[PDB]
Amino acid sequence: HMKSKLPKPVQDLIKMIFDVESMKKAMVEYEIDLQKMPLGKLSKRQIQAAYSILSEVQQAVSQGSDSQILDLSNRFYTLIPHDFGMKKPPLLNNADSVQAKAEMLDNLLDIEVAYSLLRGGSDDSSKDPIDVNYEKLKTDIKVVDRDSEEAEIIRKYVKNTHATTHNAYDLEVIDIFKIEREGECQRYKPFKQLHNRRLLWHGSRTTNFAGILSQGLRIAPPEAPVTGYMFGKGIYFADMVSKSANYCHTSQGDPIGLILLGEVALGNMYELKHASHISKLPKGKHSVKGLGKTTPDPSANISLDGVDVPLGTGISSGVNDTSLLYNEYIVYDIAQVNLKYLLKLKFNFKT
Numbered sequence: 001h002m003k004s005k006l007p008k009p010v011q012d013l014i015k016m017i018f019d020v021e022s023m024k025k026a027m028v029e030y031e032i033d034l035q036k037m038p039l040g041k042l043s044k045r046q047i048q049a050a051y052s053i054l055s056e057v058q059q060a061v062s063q064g065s066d067s068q069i070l071d072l073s074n075r076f077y078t079l080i081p082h083d084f085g086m087k088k089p090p091l092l093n094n095a096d097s098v099q100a101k102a103e104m105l106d107n108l109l110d111i112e113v114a115y116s117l118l119r120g121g122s123d124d125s126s127k128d129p130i131d132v133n134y135e136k137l138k139t140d141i142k143v144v145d146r147d148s149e150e151a152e153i154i155r156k157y158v159k160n161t162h163a164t165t166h167n168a169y170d171l172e173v174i175d176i177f178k179i180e181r182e183g184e185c186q187r188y189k190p191f192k193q194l195h196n197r198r199l200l201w202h203g204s205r206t207t208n209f210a211g212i213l214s215q216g217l218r219i220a221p222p223e224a225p226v227t228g229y230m231f232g233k234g235i236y237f238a239d240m241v242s243k244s245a246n247y248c249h250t251s252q253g254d255p256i257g258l259i260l261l262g263e264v265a266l267g268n269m270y271e272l273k274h275a276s277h278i279s280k281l282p283k284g285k286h287s288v289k290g291l292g293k294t295t296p297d298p299s300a301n302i303s304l305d306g307v308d309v310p311l312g313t314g315i316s317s318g319v320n321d322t323s324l325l326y327n328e329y330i331v332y333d334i335a336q337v338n339l340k341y342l343l344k345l346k347f348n349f350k351t
């Protein structure tokens with residue numbers, strides 16, 4: 001084949017996110033049986049069906065027995081097969097079981113998109129598959145220059161917003177990509193001049209990124225249990241890099257992770273201290289802010305293309321009885337997100 005004229009960082013990114021064995025490795029982390037439910041047999045209607053059974057388990061948990069829960073728990077394992085042998089699988093009887101399986105199904109939908117792109121489309125042996133798979137993302141990916149002003153700001157945002165409670169690792173920036181999804185700037189147009197626009201982190205495991213870069217950051221479907229998410233079904237961001245970095249699910253077994261920096265139109269923020277499982281904001285509000293105990297220093301804010309970057313060192317917020325150690329931002333319209341950068345990170349585990 002032609003050998004591909006993309007930059008080397010962009011080629012390694014494409015290899016990373018379209019890695020088939022990594023998708024299988026991700027599925028087994030959720031205790032799924034690849035013998036019964038392999039990567040090829042995965043589909044949206046199976047995942048939505050599973051979401052719905054998880055919504056029924058939510059219902060029984062919220063109204064209190066282990067007799068009826070058994071039936072609802074088993075119907076979930078029917079739709080998404082798990083690897084337990086001749087088993088008796090673990091009972092899904094609490095809020096944690098609902099949250100845990102909801103976050104799995106979240107990941108399965110992103111993996112299904114990644115694999116469907118991979119096994120959809122055309123097969124040209126004369127083209128480099130790195131180029132072929134790059135075009136399927138419908139995203140322009142350019143490498144940011146390490147001496148640029150935007151690179152200095154971004155590295156400082158990584159540097160300053162690593163929390164003391166997440167000091168089992170620290171992060172090196174390997175590559176900084178400027179990204180532009182097809183039609184996203186057009187979709188963002190109603191919110192482009194809205195007040196309180198902020199550059200915020202979104203971390204996910206590397207097997208989600210083909211899905212994210214093709215479909216954008218999305219909302220979990222109607223079938224999904226709204227109790228499974230702390231502030232309901234929206235798109236979640238953080239202003240502390242380490243908080244988002246944790247959702248990469250790096251370890252000593254693959255700490256090369258990916259993380260987004262997106263422009264989020266927060267507007268009038270509906271501020272909250274504790275969990276509120278809502279599927280629609282109160283009138284006049286454009287986002288939720290989960291109030292953190294710690295927050296980046298408001299006086300040390302910096303502008304990048306007219307977008308605030310909260311890159312100050314973590315200080316006390318003056319908020320008392322909150323569930324959250326750090327801030328949290330949620331939007332419930334996908335048009336309020338415009339993804340600007342993607343960072344490839346280097347997790348130095350000190351344990």
Ligand SMILES: CC(C)CCN1CC[C@@H](NC(=O)c2cc(Cn3c(=O)[nH]c(=O)c4ccccc43)ccc2F)C1
Pocket residue numbers: 105106107109110201202203204217218219220221229233234235236237238243244245247328329
């Ligand atoms: C399931 C599939 C159709 C894609 C639908 N969503 C794309 C966005 C994905 N998930 C989220 O935005 C989300 C992500 C999390 C966890 N999370 C997270 O994964 N990364 C973060 O940076 C983060 C920051 C603050 C709080 C939570 C974070 C919790 C609830 C969510 F709804 C699922």
